[PDB]
Amino acid sequence: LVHGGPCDKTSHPYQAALYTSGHLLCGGVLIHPLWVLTAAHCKKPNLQVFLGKHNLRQRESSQEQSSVVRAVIHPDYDAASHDQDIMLLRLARPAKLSELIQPLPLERDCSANTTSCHILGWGKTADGDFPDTIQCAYIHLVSREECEHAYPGQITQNMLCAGDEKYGKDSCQGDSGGPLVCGDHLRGLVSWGNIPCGSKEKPGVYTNVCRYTNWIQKTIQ
Ligand SMILES: [Mg+2]
Description:
Blueprint: E1 5-6, E2 15-20, E3 23-32, E4 35-38, E5 48-51, E6 64-73, E7 87-91, E8 116-121, E9 135-142, H1 144-150, E10 159-163, E11 179-182, E12 185-192, E13 204-208, H2 213-220
The protein binds magnesium ion (MG).
């Protein structure tokens, strides 16, 4: 995440870190004791899920690890256009909850008006390096019209744009699958955007979570 700062230690209990081959690959969101929601492009064999993490370079009393027993990629995910970039990961065992490990509810109403939101993750920072401490930044939802104007013919109904016209705070490589949180509910998942990262001109594009309430419910229940 670029142009943000370190998160408060107790502000992201729903954040998951997804690892493969010993390195962080993506973020994710705990939405139920047995399920982590993330981006479909984060699919890899042998994913490892870590909950309760804050600083990747420090063993933390709150961290918990879990293997994935099943990965459900949206049936219509398209890896070129990024359409329907969403995937559910079933954990081997339900997560043990605490102040540092908690699920985040989903925003079910696509018309919700809480436009001030925040993003978080261990993805690339402004200096081009990957941080040990998870980063946080507040950004604002952008109207679909402006989204379409920035990426003509590339934005689908399954995508939501968000950015910061002041400093260009934005998600980046490694933040993929992480949460776009608005009004204490999950509004989106980090999907794609400008490269190099920065949202002043081109906003970040997030999977429009409100569109998947039915699919997620059916998959989990
Ligand atoms: Mg298709």
